[PDB]
């Protein structure tokens, strides 16, 4: 019940390259989906989507929202999975 | 116009994602896999 | 939180034996539902509808027709009991 933060930003970065072409050397803790990723708010749903469909990982619309960095999303999936 | 637009383009989709697995019925068909454990980093 | 492996064969016992016939001397945490005990798909449907109605133990579709063993039914209401 303890993914580690490499483990989710391994599974993470792997999505994102499919959605968007970024390669996971980029996919740091610490970008910014909108200014340094570039990602806009309908990719980040595909993300989320594909996110759930591979991991179990359910984010919602009033949520996903609230992510601005890669680390907010990996914090949300651990505390997340902390339950 | 109308059809490629509007109808294959969005509304046989959405109708493919409402009935999720009973789009498919008599195969049964899972919404979405097992879940898997978080890759190991790289 | 610790329903034992006895208390729930013997909860389950008595619904196998409304759904099907068989007594609960014969439900034991090895037999096949398909193969000893010759319990088929749709049985195995109301086996759970009931187990929901009674012991609020939901199991989905995808998840029943993993479940081949009584052992296996009982390992899954054990580890859904531990959240
Ligand atoms: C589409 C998104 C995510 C796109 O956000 P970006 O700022 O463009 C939207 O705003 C939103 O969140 N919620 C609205 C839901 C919606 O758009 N539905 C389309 C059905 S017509
Ligand atoms: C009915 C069952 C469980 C019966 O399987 P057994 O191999 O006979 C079937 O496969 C199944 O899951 N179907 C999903 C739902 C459904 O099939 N039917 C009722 C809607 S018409």
């Known amino acids: 019940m303890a993914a580690t933060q490499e483990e989710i930003i391994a599974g993470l970065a792997e999505?994102?390259?499919?959605?968007?072409?970024?390669?996971?050397?980029?996919?740091?803790?610490?970008?910014?989906?909108?200014?340094?990723?570039?990602?806009?708010?309908?990719?980040?749903?595909?993300?989320?989507?594909?996110?759930?469909?591979?991991?179990?990982?359910?984010?919602?619309?009033?949520?996903l929202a609230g992510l601005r960095t890669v680390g907010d999303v990996v914090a949300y999936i651990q505390k997340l999975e902390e339950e | 116009?109308?059809?490629?637009?509007?109808?294959?383009?969005?509304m046989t989709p959405s109708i493919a994602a409402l009935l999720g697995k009973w789009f498919w019925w008599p195969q049964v068909v899972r919404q979405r896999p097992i879940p898997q454990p978080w890759p190991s980093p790289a």
Chains 1, 3 share one sequence.
């Open chain 1, 15 to 63: 999505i994102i390259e499919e959605v968007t072409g970024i390669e996971p050397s980029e996919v740091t803790p610490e970008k910014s989906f909108v200014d340094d990723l570039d990602i806009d708010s309908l990719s980040m749903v595909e993300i989320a989507v594909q996110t759930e469909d591979k991991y179990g990982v359910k984010i919602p619309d009033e949520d």
């Open chain 2, 1 to 10: 116009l109308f059809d490629t637009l509007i109808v294959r383009s969005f």
